[PDB]
Design a protein around this ligand. Structure first.
Ligand SMILES: Nc1nc2c(ncn2[C@@H]2O[C@H](COP(=O)(O)OP(=O)(O)OP(=O)(O)O)[C@@H](O)[C@H]2O)c(=O)[nH]1
Ligand SMILES: Nc1nc2c(ncn2[C@@H]2O[C@H](COP(=O)(O)OP(=O)(O)OP(=O)(O)O)[C@@H](O)[C@H]2O)c(=O)[nH]1
Ligand SMILES: [Mg+2]
Ligand SMILES: [Mg+2]
Lengths: 166, 166
């Protein structure tokens, strides 16, 4: 079986666990409850091919210092998430792309910038500046919603395909 | 207003007009009725940006000989469609990628291979061989359905994004 090892990285509050749960469980997590490490494995079919999504929902702050590195070495593909109503969350996307290139010892890794929570209207991070960071890295930018599920299968699949053409 | 000039090319029978109508009208066209040229213009929002899809649904055989060339010069991005139950339709995708590179005078054009009609189970063109043609061209491969609408916004958006990062 073909498989893909997706790590979902980025800051606290953003909606890392509410996207992974929307995709693997089809319901929204309104409940506040933070993460250390979490593997979801689903058998899926993407463009008629049988694959196993082996996702590792993690975090963005703790005593996960460069203890972050162990998971980054082995993740084939990364989802980088920011929240569109959180200026700081967008600015720390650098800090994560720099050590995903440090532990991967390559400038080209399959990734996706994800401007999450896109149904709230207190946007602070324009689409224009997140679509400009994303083509500065040579990467996609997809906008998603975990309350709504719009954007979720788009994000996750765009990434899987990026892992296919590496 | 940002806009994108999408040409939908490929053979007869494949479902070029049933994808363009599914996206711009949300219903399936079961009815048999062939094409010469057709512009659909919709105002859409893709990853929070306002854009105009200015699609030009066309064909794959007629007295559209290299009269095909006039539209290919001006289309910013191409959807190449084959039907998964039609071996020949897949094999003429070459004939279309060669003159989209001839009139565009470039080897890199934003494109998408589209294995349409994916809900029928008389597949003849495996996913494995269409995912291998697609990474041979350095392009996406998305599988779609116009009876179902699965794959339709994925195909069209993946292409728009490909036009953004050129
Ligand atoms: N409205 C809105 N809220 C969201 C969205 N996704 C998540 N949230 C909310 O944002 C908060 C945090 O969600 P989580 O999914 O727990 O985010 P997280 O990034 O995993 O945070 P940690 O695992 O602690 O690092 C929760 O209160 C969710 O209900 C979204 O798309 N829109
Ligand atoms: N089951 C199935 N049939 C499809 C699909 N999309 C289109 N068809 C059928 O395939 C036939 C042709 O559809 P059109 O959408 O007219 O295809 P076309 O490529 O535009 O053909 P021309 O414009 O003549 O070149 C019709 O009989 C549709 O009902 C699909 O996803 N699945
Ligand atoms: Mg979490
Ligand atoms: Mg037609």
């Amino acid at each position: 079986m073909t498989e893909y090892k997706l790590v979902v990285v980025g800051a606290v509050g953003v909606g890392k666990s509410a996207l992974t749960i929307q995709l693997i469980q089809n319901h929204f997590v309104d409940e506040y409850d933070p993460t250390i490490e979490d593997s979801y494995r689903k058998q899926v079919v993407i463009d008629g091919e049988t694959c196993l999504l082996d996702i590792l929902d993690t975090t963005g702050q703790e005593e996960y210092s460069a203890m972050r590195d162990q998971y980054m070495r082995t993740g084939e593909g990364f989802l980088c998430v920011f929240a569109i109503n959180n200026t700081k969350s967008f600015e720390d996307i650098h800090q994560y792309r720099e050590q995903i290139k440090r532990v991967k010892d390559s400038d080209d890794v399959p990734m996706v910038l994800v401007g999450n929570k896109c149904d709230l209207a207190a946007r602070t991070v324009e689409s224009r500046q997140a679509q400009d960071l994303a083509r500065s890295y040579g990467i996609p930018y997809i906008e998603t919603s975990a309350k709504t599920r719009q954007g979720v299968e788009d994000a996750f699949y765009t990434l899987v395909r990026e892992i296919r053409q590496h």
